[PDB]
Amino acid sequence: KNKSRVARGWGRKCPLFG
Known part of the structure; x- marks a missing residue:
């Protein structure tokens, strides 16, 4: 997954910086 939370x-x- 790309979701970087x-x-x-x-x-x-x-x-949530992403």
Whole structure:
């Protein structure tokens, strides 16, 4: 899958960097 929404779990600010 190309959907990169968990690649680098960004629980700091934006949850979905991709």
